[PDB]
Amino acid sequence: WVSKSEIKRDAEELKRLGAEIVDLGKNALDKIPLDADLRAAIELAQRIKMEGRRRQLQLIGKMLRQRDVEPIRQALDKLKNRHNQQVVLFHKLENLRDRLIDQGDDAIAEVLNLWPDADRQQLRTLIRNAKKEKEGNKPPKSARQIFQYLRELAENEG
Amino acid sequence: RNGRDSEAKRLGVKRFGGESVLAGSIIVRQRGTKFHAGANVGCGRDHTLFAKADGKVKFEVKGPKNRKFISIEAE
RNA sequence: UUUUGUAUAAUGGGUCAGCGACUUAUAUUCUGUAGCAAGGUUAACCGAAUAGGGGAGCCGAAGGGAAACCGAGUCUUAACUGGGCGUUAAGUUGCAGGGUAUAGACCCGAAACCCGGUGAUCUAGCAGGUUGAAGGUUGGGUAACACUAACUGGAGGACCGGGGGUAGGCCAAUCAAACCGGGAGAUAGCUGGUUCUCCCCGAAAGCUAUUUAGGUAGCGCCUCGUGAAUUCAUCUCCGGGGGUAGAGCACUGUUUCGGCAAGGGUACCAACCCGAUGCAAACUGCGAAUACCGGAGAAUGUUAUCACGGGAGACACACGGCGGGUGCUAACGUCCGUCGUGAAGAGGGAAACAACCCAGACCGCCAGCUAAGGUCCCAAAGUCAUGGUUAAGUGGGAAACGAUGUGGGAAGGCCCAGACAGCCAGGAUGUUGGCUUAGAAGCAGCCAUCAUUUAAAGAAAGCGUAAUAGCUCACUGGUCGAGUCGGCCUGCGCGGAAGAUGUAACGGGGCUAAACCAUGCACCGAAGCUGCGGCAGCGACGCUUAUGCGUUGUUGGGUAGGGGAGCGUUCUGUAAGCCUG
RNA sequence: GUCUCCACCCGAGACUCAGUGAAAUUGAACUCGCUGUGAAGAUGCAGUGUACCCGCGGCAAGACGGAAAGACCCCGUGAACCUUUACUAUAGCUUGACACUGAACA
RNA sequence: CUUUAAUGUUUGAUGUUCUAACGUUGACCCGUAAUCCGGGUUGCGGACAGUGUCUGGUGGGUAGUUUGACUGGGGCGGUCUCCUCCUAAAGAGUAACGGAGGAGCACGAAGGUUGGCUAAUCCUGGUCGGACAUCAGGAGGUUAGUGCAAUGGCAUAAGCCAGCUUGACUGCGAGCGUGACGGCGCGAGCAGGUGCGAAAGCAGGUCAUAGUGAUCCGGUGGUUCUGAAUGGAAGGGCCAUCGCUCAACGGAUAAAAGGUACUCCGGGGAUAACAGGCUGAUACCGCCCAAGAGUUCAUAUCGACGGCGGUGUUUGGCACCUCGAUGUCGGCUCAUCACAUCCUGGGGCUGAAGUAGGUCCCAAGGGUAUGGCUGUUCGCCAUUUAAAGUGGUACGCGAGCUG
RNA sequence: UGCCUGGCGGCCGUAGCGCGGUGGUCCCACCUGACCCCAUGCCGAACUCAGAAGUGAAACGCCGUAGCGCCGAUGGUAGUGUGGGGUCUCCCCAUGCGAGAGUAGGGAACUGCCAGGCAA
């Protein structure tokens, strides 16, 4: 006995994977081990639009029903992991910059702890300049400089 | 769990005896072969009985197993 | 008004006078009517102009195919005996009307969205503390700075108990967002209303689908118009086929009896099976009654039948009966196939009660007949008759049970060789028993359940004694004696049948027959029928041929809905006419 | 009854918008009590009983009393609210290229 | 031209210096007794920062939306397409959150023709082998098998064996059944050419009934069909095929998750939180059977197992009127009424020598407390008396009062 | 015209099965060989090729056997359409139809055409 609800959920997952691989770019498709027929179908789906695109995606899912998906899932998982790592690094940099702009010495302490080589005097000067810019509605030049400095520190650490 | 009912296949006798029918008409719609074909009567792939000529329908018992056969008389 | 179903204690309205609810524009489809007629027709514009000019333009007279292309024929095919679509009917302009789509679109009743402002003299806001960098101060440092250890001011906008600014909190004391002018009279599968009259016809709450269940499109059904055949319906005859009731186990299952009894662990469980027993909506070697349609037939039914076009409504049905699914064979629970009722019909009777019984209203008459139901009165008729039943208010509630309440049916035994019961008498003695000896001796029990006198007495049935004892009864003599006992069918009754606003489970009076069983006579008893008169739709025959009918028969309950026919008022020409101080 | 341990009165704080000569209310009333039924609990239905007509002061068994198109609950391919790793997009963010943006040099 | 390079040209990148653009909320002077702004000089960085377009994700901080339908209150559970049997009441068809189930395959053969053949249910004999492996005979005649789960029928076998083949072909197809329709199924026969067969004949798929997805749109091949001045090309149309768990399967978007008891609007007794009546599985009271207990003895008292009367006081079903409103459970006063009587009076029975009593009939005229425990209806404990009885009346009365 | 035989049809269990008798005169079978036509998932087992030596074992045709299966009345009964009634989850009344099984009875099939031996 196989539950039709489980079958429908599996079909939805397969269609989601098909849509994700279709959205993936040329480099991602090349990296992912896709057979010739599946690759041609994906390219045709990308070329077409409207309800035709969704029905081609449904065809892709139907093919995936029989074709193995574990290598495709692994490739998608690793690509998404890399992308999420990059996005998390960017979010951490933005949050650190925001904390530096808001609090001050409290965020400077965390910056120094994360990167001992960071210059306390330079960070304090940049934070003061950012506060002055906020007060005088000046462009966030200090904020951009702080972001660049944090990016350089992260690159040096890595 | 139960309750799934299929729509009826419209089974039964469509043309009865003593009535004039045209060629190609369907006499009986049956799954099996309750009634067999006789003179001027044909049986399709799906056990569909049809008349090969215009006439009146008739029923007759024949065969070692006493099976009912349908025939057409040119009346 | 919503609900199938309303005064119901489901909605609503105080009255009066006035105001008010499908109009109008743009295109399309159809009906009536007028001209022209293979033509009709104008628009803008000109126009001393509602005339005339203006044929620009629009529609059919020939279409097929997507098109090329072909043509009274064309389209897929090499093309069909082919099949799809054309000719053998004539289109147009106006008017009036029935619908469709867009504009407010029959009208009223929302929240809410966007645009520009009135915004703060009420209120939320400079209340207050805190988070808190900014300034200063003191303190280490430094020539002096930065930084840091503590104090102060408080940014910030907030944290805390008018599309914004600042506890449905506030910005007119119901503002996580008011009002004004506009989109916008926004939209609403929703509530409510939709105003004069007459006549004819007059259904449904059903099937298919729905991001779809109270709604909608098609079908089902209703109305109006056109055309068409014993067209259709009841019934008689003829042709069929079911697997339903019934019956049954040929086959598939199911419970048991006795077995053959594999297998299982031989006093013990048991498969495939045998004959019977019942049962099966998911079994039919058999198989109905009904019903289905097809061919013929006299009769009747205003063609009650079918196809097309315009217009609808409806698309929540409930009760009863019939055979059922589910619920506990319980419903006024729910779902199925069919008829009736109501929805769409009041009537008379059941006291009142939609679904219970009789019965389909054209109107009028101070006439009679009649259906169901009644005839003692309320309240109209029998205080009716014939042969019976009831002693209990049974009738006028209720069931298993028990029964000398009562009248019969089949009968059994005993019966003047005097039946049962009465009136006078016996029921003596071992049987103080071996047995549990405690005394049970028959009267609680293992126990024989015997044995002389016998018209007659048991080794024992009750009352009665610690057991004895004593009084009755099994049976027996004297007198009378004729009927006596138990069970069933039993119809009518008895207790089971006791509850709360005040009798109340016959309507009451009140009935011992004025209650029940079967029959008759007649009577009462409806808007049913007939007797007379009057109005209207309908097919015809005899005129009239547009309207009167000599007339015949027939119909006239009606929601929604459809069709037909009319009245009231304002204004315009009729109307510089008519009435009118 | 000093006071506790609080509770009750005689007079104030704390807070508390009846007022016109009105009011909710009205389909119309010659507006009785019980029994049975009734879209199910009867002033109005069938049966039965009571009661001279109308005022004045009290009681409150009823007229499903009035004050809120439920303050209970649900429905709406209705609205609004907020939440997001629900869909579609945006403010801001950062990557590099293109002109503002150069001149000498290795 | 791959592999080479002094020499003449081009920009790209790294690194150093300068500033002439740029920034200067750096200073000084002037309009200006002017903290704004503008005109000039200078220092500091300087082609950097930023500026406008594109390019990447982050993105509810922000804007527009969504989260289907059915259900014994609701939530929750479960279903959304096709087919077989009964429900489904003997034409046909027929629903329910009914009872049993299967399917979204597969076969180039398991299809066609032609020519032939026919199992079990059991016994008999035989090495493994015995109830059942295979062999020979016998009652046997489809109950075997008929690819699937099932229905029918299949002996003329539609079941099994064997030579050859792709008619599972091409354009149709009068007519018939079905459905509102789309559409689906059958279908004699016409034109071409094929497979089997000497032929009458069959082959337009599987012995039939489930194996399915219409429309719009995309790829593939053709079609000069058209091809917007000409000739082309491009683009559009026609045919055949490949494309959807579009499983919400007649298929509203290619694209959507929670609640708001902070809520508003319109509606709902189609539908609830409470109330009458219709209902009666269950529960309560009484009784028959009542084995037997009660020294013994069925009824002084119980009385196993079943059975029968009254109650609706809880669990059981419609809401038939109540969302244009029925404010629920406690308490205070008023309670009338039925006796199935707490005692109070008249009484019968015994295991009633008397108080005491246990049981049962009539009797409603009389009354039937106070404190701890809970807001509670209800329920337990203590002290007196004759007792501190039960019920319904909207689980009474907030139009009598108290939250 | 009859006893019979082979083939083709109707009815197709009253028609079919168990028992005894009868037949090789026509027709039917077994049988010799199959090396040659053909055939076995091995085999002349089956089919087939030239014969008929011999017989009727078995089959096949006819008669009797009612023994079985089967058909089959009449009546009754269950049931059922119509209207009504009752102590209405059931039954009865008037009416129309009407069962199944069993029962009387039947039953060893009958019938049309063509071709052949015998007697006519």
UniProtKB/Swiss-Prot annotation, chain A:
Q: Which residues form a coiled coil?
A: none
* First-listed, main subcellular location of the protein, grouped into a coarse class: cytoplasm
Q: Kindly list the GO molecular function terms attached to this UniProt entry.
A: ribosomal large subunit binding; rRNA binding
What is the deletion mutant like?
Slow growth at 16 degrees Celsius, accumulates a pre-50S ribosomal assembly particle, although some mature 50S subunits are formed. Ribosomal proteins uL16, bL33, bL35 and bL36 are missing while 23S rRNA helices H38, the L1 stalk and H89 (part of the peptidyl transferase center) are incorrectly positioned.
Q: Which GO terms describe its cellular component?
A: cytosol
Give the span(s) annotated as Not required for functional ribosome assembly: 86-158
Its localization reads: Cytoplasm
Instruction: Reply yes or no: does the keyword Nuclease apply.
Output: no
| Domain free text | Has several regions, N-terminal loop (residues 1-25), a central domain (residues 26-105), joined by linker (residues 105-116) to the C-terminal domain (residues 117-183). The C-terminal domain is not required for function, while the N-terminal loop is; shortening the linker decreases assembly.
| Cross-referenced CDD domains | YjgA-like (cd16331)
Domain of life, per lineage: Bacteria
What is known about its subunit structure?
Answer: Interacts with RluD in late stage pre-50S ribosomal subunits. Interacts with ribosomal protein uL16 (rlpP), via the N-terminal loop of this protein.
What keywords is this UniProt entry annotated with?
A: Cytoplasm, Ribosome biogenesis, RNA-binding, rRNA-binding
Entry-linked InterPro entries: DarP, DarP_sf
What family does this chain come from, according to its entry? Belongs to the DarP family.
**Which Gene Ontology BP terms does the record give?**
assembly of large subunit precursor of preribosome
The name this protein carries in UniProt is Dual-action ribosomal maturation protein DarP
Please give one Pfam family short name.
Answer: DarP
The organism is Escherichia coli (strain K12)
The entry's function note states: Member of a network of 50S ribosomal subunit biogenesis factors (ObgE, RluD, RsfS and DarP) which assembles along the 30S-50S interface, preventing incorrect 23S rRNA structures from forming. Promotes peptidyl transferase center (PTC) maturation. Binds pre-50S ribosomal subunits near the 23S rRNA L1 stalk, where it may mediate correct positioning of the L1 stalk.
Signal peptide (residue range): none
From Swiss-Prot, chain B:
Please tell me whether the keyword tRNA-binding is annotated for this protein. Answer: yes
Supply the alphabetized keyword list: Ribonucleoprotein, Ribosomal protein, RNA-binding, rRNA-binding, tRNA-binding
This entry's Gene Ontology molecular function terms read: ribosome binding; rRNA binding; structural constituent of ribosome; tRNA binding
| Matches recorded under Pfam families | Ribosomal_L27
Q: Name one GO biological process term.
A: regulation of cell growth
Q: Give Gene Ontology CC terms.
A: cytoplasm; cytosolic large ribosomal subunit
- Record's family? Belongs to the bacterial ribosomal protein bL27 family.
Indicate what this protein is called per its UniProt record. Large ribosomal subunit protein bL27
Q: Which organism is it from?
A: Escherichia coli (strain K12)
Source taxonomy: Bacteria, Pseudomonadati, Pseudomonadota, Gammaproteobacteria, Enterobacterales
